[PDB]
Ligand binder design. Structure first.
Ligand SMILES: CCOP(=O)(O)[C@@](O)(CCC(=O)O)[C@H]1SC(CCOP(=O)(O)OP(=O)(O)O)=C(C)N1Cc1cnc(C)nc1N
Ligand SMILES: CCOP(=O)(O)[C@@](O)(CCC(=O)O)[C@H]1SC(CCOP(=O)(O)OP(=O)(O)O)=C(C)N1Cc1cnc(C)nc1N
Ligand SMILES: [Mg+2]
Ligand SMILES: [Mg+2]
Ligand SMILES: [Mg+2]
Ligand SMILES: [Mg+2]
Lengths: 855, 846
């Protein structure tokens, strides 16, 4: 036969090989540190021969040039892992073509960005040699690349770009991308802060955020740009950014829950190479990308891949070929780009935005670069990486190289290039001198943020009977032909009954609070593991048609007034992924993104929230004091000693009480359905943006004593301290009391039952419903009503090193010495675990506490 | 026609798995060219095959009960190896092998239906709908024994846990029934304990048809799904290092196999999965490949897969380390066993991870008291029509003529009758009184007067090792002074913190101990202080001075070794791995170092669920050391605190030792005590940063040769100098670096009326030594606990409450001197830190 047929078969193989594996041979590294193949008779003599390609006839030389330019020069394209053929086709059409050369104006603009990037760093090196700044030097191309992302988003008519990033070039991005004034950055280096800058305990300069407006230079549009605050914990901000963006999209009615699919707020997430591969929160956050409850229509990721992590080489930081391989699991295309090629970096940035817009999904840019100086500006890197730094020492920076290219192209002269650099440096010198001339302020110890947010003078949380009845009736206002599961129907009927007749249980009180907020126009977002039904089969926020699988959400009916007009409210209820770190981070972020939303995250059991410890420690408990960033997120933590073992017993009350300071969080363990209802309504309506930690029940959901009357919802309020009903409403005599038992949570009912059984008029039980801030005034006033008390005990089911005793045992006698001197503890022994593993052992220990309290 | 065939072969290999008949629920060119011959790359050379035959091979390999994902793998030899085994005829099992697979399905289902009958009201997380897990695991272990491997170590969650314990590991049925009965012997009832579906076991597996045996173990775990994953890897790595197999071994057998089970919702959602996979090829952590099994029942409690993950498969995360993925229909026992054996063979051939995604279903509710039709009515209507895998396989064998119905029933009734007999025997045992759980504190006790001092010759040897450079080695010019200073300190004293650490580890190595040290940038040290490894300035070659201590002066080995690594940028998986390693080799000295103590909260699940509580819950002992750089230096709220207060709150029952040493010699003695005491309990050390280079924080040679660990330290002026204790009216109790600032202030103002006492060991509290020290100051009228940490942090929250209760004649009236209570661990400003620090010093001497 004709050997052109064999040769053509090799050409088809070559095209497939460049598309699939060309990235492995691409010239992406600016440092350049690193017989049995059947050719089917194809050789260098066939370069001028025409071959069949799938439709079109082209020379081998031309096929090879297109493939080499697309896949083996300064851009390594990874996309053949993507399931959708239309997405592979979209990328092929855009990468397998001769690109239009940028205009001289565009080239000068890119150079102005590289000038600003390097000169900002060398200026800080000259003025503040002894201070850490985590310089971008060796990765200056990040600045024209981020400019190109934002400019392309503005071109698509998008509303906002929200950035999260680590330390690398942070100050540079704040000044040269977001627009944080140079004067402000210099004042941070000077340590000369005004009262607004010195507010709260604060944080380091490379953790701060900013907001501004990006104005296009080549078009008629502009776009909002924000950069969120973060702790040192690398990648921890990733789910926070997604939550922040989702809240903004929901507000704009764009995205998943919106009337249009614009997803008009873009998450722009930066990463370091060692952190992106090593931190599990990265995989957890990527796992949220296509979920109905969390999708943001695609995140644009940029890895500042300087092929080092402090002193650690990539071979000790990851097991994958690329630091970006984790992102392929959600079908993200990956673009590896040579950081010494500013034009390729800007081109990839615009392509990434276009892909995100076309398919509303994640895209990753792996910018290969290097770190000119040590990890921080005081560290010597040649001690551990002598070869890398011998190579770095021979390298001209990307600014110098790009300037030489423009001088060579005839675009600019050396004199013009020199003058432009001196002008920008002169501007920095002027601002530096102006800041240095400012009046120095006296340095004082940091101050508590407690008084910055206070409850409004007037706020009622009580609702009328009509509201309770409406929420009860909503549970039986089923869509026509809907088939309720036969074991769910009694719950719906019981809710209508409770709404009109009382004996309201915990699960219905929660829905009365959320339903009444929705009716008042509030957005309520509730999520967690199996949260739609409830772990304890108690919530049924969503019910499923037994015959069709169709879903009905009773509380959504409260978003429409009886006359048919919308209230402005909405109920967004989701089953989360099996994640704690990313889920809690997302809900924290969501509440920051929309301060007017009611946002609740529910742990399956409180015992699993330690999986989100970095978010609790670094954002929830401390973001207000450190950054002035406010969150109103609610954490619901099922808690209680029931004999189910050490991972089904405790939300670690003691840890949240230890973290507590400056009124940063509200911490509560309500004992009645009505008090929980009032707590949630207070939290949603007070205008205070501070997290709420609630220790919620499990068996107490179905305790027939733990029910509330209609008047507790219509004629009461949140009560931080509760007395026994026999003293406030009944015929109980407070003067007969000689022993006072102070407690919190479900053990109250067991203590009250024992009191009734033995007719102990000499013992009274007082509940502390709000654990923090301690209700000092209400507690003192309650105790003053018992003048004949001779002994006081703090009773708890938790071990002695757990529960409220570690905090209360120390704070109550100090804060109220005339009431709690001599306060003694009644609890389980101190334990390494939160409880015994045996239900029988739990029961014997529980009885010991009750016997000791009445002994 | 020819071009259509090569692209058709590539389509089946790359995407055939998307059309494979893998789900047991089933919830979701020209036609005249069939007899034409085409050239293909055969497994024994180029072949000419009919398109009809090419298509039948591709459909059987990639579109029946096995979905093969492998074309993401970079190595062409690995893709070829998989093709050779999947694109050829599979070995048909013998009748005896088929009967053996059926015996495993019988045990799997009958164990569950027996527990359903006897204990209807107790959770057991039944394997029903996934019984093929049992012959699958049997096949993995049997194939490992066929390769002559030493041990299989299993970690798994709740799904079929009791079933695996009884039918794979060999945990006695009498023991499992006693747990359901709640009638435990004193050993079973020891400590606070844990739920039955978290327990472990060990035994010996004997091949049914071959001539080998293999050890099989299953480790304990908390409820926290996937948290045990890095613990399993650490446990296996420690066992491999002991056997001289694997990464640091004389052979590349990696003869201890990690077998890691997962649930589908947990595998996709928990970040510790990606962190643990990321360790798989690292020199410090590699175990030569893990075999993963996902019991993929297409549900997570009430949650559908579309709400649990964003990837096509729950296993997609594993593709990042080039693991092949085998998706297999759980209703096909023979395909499940075949994939299991193929996975072992792949792991042995390439010493890398392999994933088996077993598609199955959950017959009952999430737990046996939950009603799943409320949220998944369609799935459970389909499940209600399904014949189980045991019934279906029995019908196949009866139809094949292998067995009769009578033989099938007799075999099932025999197993059930044996369960009934053991159940009756356990139920006949008298029930005794249930008591409150007891503290494990007295279970482990330090020997009387343990000597940790070393002689001058040992110190000198470790100093001299720093300049015993390999021939032609070029030391970096800024590293050479450190090596020279170490030789000087070894012979002349003024030993600093970093050298005291290396004197402790070096002397343990010389005594024959394995020392494993790792953490972020730990080879050099975050504060450029350690230099455990030095790099040749001209060639990049590495030299490890302490490795020289593994050889005696006469040339014989000591038996010791120094394994020092830079970790991945992980806290959760790294801490879990080091905990696991210490469990795997109790004789090893194992230390993990946080970059700053402020980042160890990233490993909170390991601290809470394994380190602080594993002894009380499971009787599992770990001697892992956590080194947490800590101290108020003005570097911000994430470069200041290891959260001492949290470790002291977690502390109970003597489960951990917690210390904040103030001198290099006291740290040396602490490490040597920990390595030589024969006690297996974690040690938490709050270590210094600026104090590494504080010229006052240096130790004398006699502190190493003639002393021991001191849990309480007095000022040198009273123990050795001419200081008068009777002049003291104010006592300052403290811990850590603030001692030096308090001592400097006392010397500057000549304050003979003030004494400073350090508590070096924070937990267990040194009650006797503290009381005896305070008794030496009879004229003290006021006592203060001084700390740089905020009032709600540091040792005050625990000491403020415990010291007046345990020593009332010494600490009644104890007052606090500290920073105010704070939401963050410190101010963000170095200038603000400095003003606050001066306030503490002024208050202490006010
Ligand atoms: C002295 C070492 O610690 P550190 O420098 O103080 C710091 O904490 C800095 C970040 C910060 O504090 O904001 C950082 S910088 C760094 C190396 C990062 O490498 P890569 O991701 O490749 O980024 P890069 O190459 O651009 O740097 C680690 C491990 N540090 C400590 C650290 C540990 N673990 C976690 C979760 N977060 C951290 N910040
Ligand atoms: C009542 C719900 O909580 P729970 O059942 O008590 C439990 O804690 C059980 C495990 C245990 O406690 O050991 C488990 S079972 C489960 C669903 C798992 O689904 P999948 O991975 O697909 O496995 P499966 O389908 O085989 O079940 C969750 C979320 N539970 C709570 C939980 C949450 N978060 C973490 C990190 N670990 C957990 N154990
Ligand atoms: Mg890096
Ligand atoms: Mg609020
Ligand atoms: Mg599952
Ligand atoms: Mg020990």
């Amino acid at each position: 036969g004709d050997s052109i047929e064999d040769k053509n078969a090799r050409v088809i193989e070559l095209i497939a090989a460049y598309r699939n594996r060309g990235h492995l041979m691409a010239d992406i590294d600016p440092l350049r540190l690193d017989l049995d193949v059947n050719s089917h008779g194809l050789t260098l003599w066939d370069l001028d021969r025409e071959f069949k390609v799938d439709v079109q006839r082209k020379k081998l030389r031309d096929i090879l040039s297109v493939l080499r330019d697309a896949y083996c020069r300064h851009v390594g394209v990874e996309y053949t892992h993507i399931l959708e053929p239309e997405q592979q086709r979209w990328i092929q059409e855009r990468v397998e073509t001769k690109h239009d050369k940028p205009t001289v104006a565009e080239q000068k603009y890119i150079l102005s960005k590289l000038n600003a990037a390097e000169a900002f760093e060398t200026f800080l090196q000259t003025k503040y040699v002894g201070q850490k700044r985590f310089s971008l030097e060796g990765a200056e191309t990040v600045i024209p690349m981020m400019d190109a992302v934002i400019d392309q988003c503005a071109e698509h008519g998008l509303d906002e770009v929200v950035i999260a990033m680590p330390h690398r070039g942070r100050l540079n991005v704040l000044a040269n991308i977001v627009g944080k004034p140079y004067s402000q950055i210099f004042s941070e280096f000077e340590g000369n802060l005004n009262p607004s800058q010195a507010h709260g305990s604060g944080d380091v300069k490379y953790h701060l955020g900013a907001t501004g407006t990006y104005i296009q230079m080549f078009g008629d549009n502009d776009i909002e740009v924000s950069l969120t605050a973060n702790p040192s914990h690398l990648e921890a901000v990733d789910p926070v950014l997604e939550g922040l963006v989702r809240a903004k999209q929901d507000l704009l009615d764009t995205g998943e829950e919106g009337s249009d699919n614009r997803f008009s707020v873009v998450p722009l997430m930066l990463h370091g190479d060692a952190a992106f591969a090593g931190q599990g929160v990265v995989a957890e956050t990527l796992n949220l990308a296509l979920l109905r409850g969390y999708r943001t229509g695609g995140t644009i990721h940029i890895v500042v891949n300087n092929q080092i992590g402090f002193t650690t080489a990539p071979t000790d930081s990851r097991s994958s070929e690329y630091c970006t391989d984790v992102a392929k699991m959600i079908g993200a295309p990956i673009f590896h780009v040579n950081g010494d090629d500013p034009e390729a970096c800007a081109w990839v940035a615009r392509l990434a935005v276009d892909f995100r817009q076309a398919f509303k999904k994640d895209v990753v840019i792996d910018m290969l670069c290097y770190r000119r100086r040590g990890h921080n500006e005081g560290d010597d890197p040649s001690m551990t990486q002598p070869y890398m730094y011998d190579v770095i020492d021979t390298k001209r920076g990307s600014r110098k190289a790009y300037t030489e290219a423009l001088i060579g192209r005839g675009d600019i002269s050396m004199k013009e290039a020199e003058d432009a650099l001196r002008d920008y440096q002169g501007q920095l010198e002027r601002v530096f001198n102006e800041v240095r001339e400012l009046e120095k302020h006296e340095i004082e110890p940091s101050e508590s943020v407690e008084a910055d947010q206070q409850i409004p003078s007037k706020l009622a949380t009580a609702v009328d009977k009509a509201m309770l009845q409406r929420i009860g009736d909503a549970h039986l206002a089923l869509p026509e032909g809907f088939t309720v599961h036969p074991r769910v129907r009694p719950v719906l009927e019981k809710r209508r009954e409770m709404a009109y007749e009382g004996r309201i249980d915990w699960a219905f009180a929660e829905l009365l609070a959320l339903g009444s907020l929705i009716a008042e126009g509030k957005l309520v977002r509730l999520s967690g593991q199996d949260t739609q039904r409830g772990t304890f089969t108690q919530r049924h926020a969503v019910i499923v048609d037994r015959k069709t699988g169709e879903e009905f959400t009773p509380l959504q009916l409260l978003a429409t007034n009886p006359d048919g007009t919308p209230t402005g409210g909405k109920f967004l209820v989701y089953n989360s992924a099996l994640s704690e770190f990313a889920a809690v981070g997302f809900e924290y972020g969501y509440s920051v993104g929309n301060p007017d939303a009611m946002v609740l995250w529910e742990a399956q059991f409180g015992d699993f929230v330690n999986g989100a410890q970095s978010i609790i420690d670094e954002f929830i408990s401390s973001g207000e004091a450190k950054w002035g960033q406010l969150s109103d997120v609610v954490l619901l933590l099922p808690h209680g000693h029931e004999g189910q073992g050490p991972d089904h017993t405790s939300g670690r009350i003691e840890r949240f009480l230890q973290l507590w300071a400056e009124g940063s969080m509200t911490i509560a363990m309500p004992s009645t359905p009505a008090n929980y209802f009032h707590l949630l309504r207070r939290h949603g309506k007070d205008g205070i943006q501070r997290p709420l930690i609630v220790f919620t029940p499990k068996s107490m959901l179905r305790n027939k004593a733990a029910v509330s009357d209609i008047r507790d919802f219509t004629e009461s309020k949140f009560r931080s301290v509760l007395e026994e009903p026999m003293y406030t409403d009944g015929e109980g005599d407070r003067n007969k009391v000689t022993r006072l038992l102070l407690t919190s949570g479900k053990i109250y009912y067991e203590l009250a039952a024992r009191k009734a059984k033995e007719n102990r008029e000499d013992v009274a039980i007082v509940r502390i419903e709000q654990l923090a801030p301690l209700p000092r005034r209400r507690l003192a006033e309650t105790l003053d009503r018992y003048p004949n008390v001779k002994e006081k005990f703090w009773v708890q089911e938790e071990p002695a090193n757990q529960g409220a005793w570690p905090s209360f045992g120390l704070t109550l006698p100090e804060i109220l010495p005339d009431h709690f001197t001599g306060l003694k503890r009644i609890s389980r022994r101190a334990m390494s675990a939160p409880s015994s593993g045996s239900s029988k052992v739990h029961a014997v220990e529980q009885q010991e506490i009750l016997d000791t309290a009445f002994g």
